[PDB]
Amino acid sequence: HMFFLNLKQINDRFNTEFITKFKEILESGWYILGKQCEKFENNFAKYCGVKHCIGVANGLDALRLIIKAYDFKENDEIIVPANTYIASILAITDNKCKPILIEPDINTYNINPDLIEEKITKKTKAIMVVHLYGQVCDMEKIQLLANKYNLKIIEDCAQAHGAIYKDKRVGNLGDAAGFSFYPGANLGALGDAGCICTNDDNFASKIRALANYGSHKKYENLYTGLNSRLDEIQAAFLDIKLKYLDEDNNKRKNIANFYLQNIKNENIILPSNKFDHVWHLFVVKTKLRDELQHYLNNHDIQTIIHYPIPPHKQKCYKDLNHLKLPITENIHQEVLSLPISPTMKENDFKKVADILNKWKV
């Protein structure tokens, strides 16, 4: 079977250095908040063009912490795309803020900036942008609304490592940014991992303390914090792979281009890349989505849906189930992700295209 995402193929490239670094860490006797974390932070901050990177435990923790650090009041509002992955929302509700869900543009799969302002109220305190599937969101009007209404901009960068907008990288487009380095991310760890990026010295220092039980200095707790740290081992593996991240994204770009140039099937709506797209996911759209996934599985092609139930329709968010979000709803009914990975072989991506072209429904 062709895997959706063959992480062994992706990581095998680095095994020798993974084992060297692991042995270096064993020799150091230091496994938490050490030289590897510092090195990776400094390199990832450089990569994103930001002053400060704080290694944390995962992408949801990254968001949760950013919101926490802003000390919003219970029920304050955070504008967010309605079609993002549920963890973007969980971060908001975990802080007892209210998610205000906005429809995406069908031609980007990202928040439609034109639909935000109408939803801003006295309680709105932040906009969470999500660079979904790999494509950076059009920030122009979002930044204008943030300045106009005194809103924080929070970036969810879990799916768009390295994507660029004008002169900047995702991670440097708002006030603070959360990354996942979950193993399937464009920069993936060998375990759970994440980070927070910002230019604000004071916010950075708060965040560090907050992710370390609320302790800035040994023995002392300035805040009621969490334990959300990036392990030395994972920092070291990330730093190894970071050197190849733009290359790996360019290998995705190549595959996505092959798909775009070769899949010709009237039942399939292909993704476009209006702005920079690092192609974490290659998302097609069809009225016969389940049929297509079954067909592809018959042809030994593994696929995953991102995503078939939207946050507002989840059982955990019963109070949202009534919201009318037909664009988001229709997307969740229609999308399927095609295998794409930096290391994916030409014969595999050729086969995917050929089998999709043969789909006659």
Ligand X SMILES: Cc1ncc(COP(=O)(O)O)c(/C=N/[C@H]2[C@@H](O)[C@@H](C)O[C@H](OP(=O)(O)OP(=O)(O)OC[C@H]3O[C@@H](n4cc(C)c(=O)[nH]c4=O)C[C@@H]3O)[C@@H]2O)c1O
Query: Which positions lie near a copy of itself, rule CB under 8 A?
Result: 6-9, 11-12, 15, 18-19, 22-23, 25-32, 57-61, 64, 86-87, 90, 93-94, 182-183, 189-192, 213-214, 219-229, 231-234, 305, 307-309, 311, 314-317
Q: For residue 222, report the phi and psi dihedrals to the nearest 5 degrees.
A: -70, -30
Note whether 32 binds ligand X by CB under 6 A.
yes
The label of the residue with tokens 């907008």 reads: 165
AA letter at 35? K
If the CB atoms of residues 57 and 102 are measured against Na ion, the closer one turns out to be 57
Note whether 341 binds ligand X by CB under 6 A.
no
**Region of 22-30, 53-61, 85-93, 114-122 interacting with Na ion (CB under 5 A):** 53-61
If the CB atoms of residues 57 and 331 are measured against Na ion, the closer one turns out to be 57
Note whether 335 binds ligand X by CB under 6 A.
no
Residue 58 CB, shortest distance to Na ion, in Å, is 7
Query: CA 301, CA 175: separation in Å to the nearest integer?
Result: 41
Note whether 60 binds ligand X by CB under 6 A.
yes
Note whether 5 binds ligand X by CB under 6 A.
yes
Note whether 226 binds ligand X by CB under 6 A.
no
- Number of Cβ within 10 Å of residue 304's Cβ equals 15
Residue 315 CB, shortest distance to a copy of itself, in Å, is 5
Where is the chain broken, named by the residue before each break, C–N > 2.5 Å? none
If the CB atoms of residues 97 and 238 are measured against Na ion, the closer one turns out to be 238
Residue 303 CB, shortest distance to ligand X, in Å, is 9
Question: Exposure of 26 by Cβ count < 10 A (0-12 exposed, 13-18 middle, 19+ buried)?
Answer: exposed
Residue 7 CB, shortest distance to a copy of itself, in Å, is 5
If the CB atoms of residues 149 and 275 are measured against ligand X, the closer one turns out to be 275
Residue 222 CB, shortest distance to a copy of itself, in Å, is 5
Residue 207 CB, shortest distance to a copy of itself, in Å, is 15
If the CB atoms of residues 191 and 308 are measured against Na ion, the closer one turns out to be 191
Query: CA 226, CA 65: separation in Å to the nearest integer?
Result: 8
Nearest-CA neighbor of 138 among 160, 123, 119, 158? 160
Question: Exposure of 256 by Cβ count < 10 A (0-12 exposed, 13-18 middle, 19+ buried)?
Answer: buried
Binding site for ligand X (CB under 6 A): 4-5, 7, 29-32, 58-60, 84-85, 87-88, 130, 156, 158-159, 180, 182-184, 192, 194, 227, 304, 306
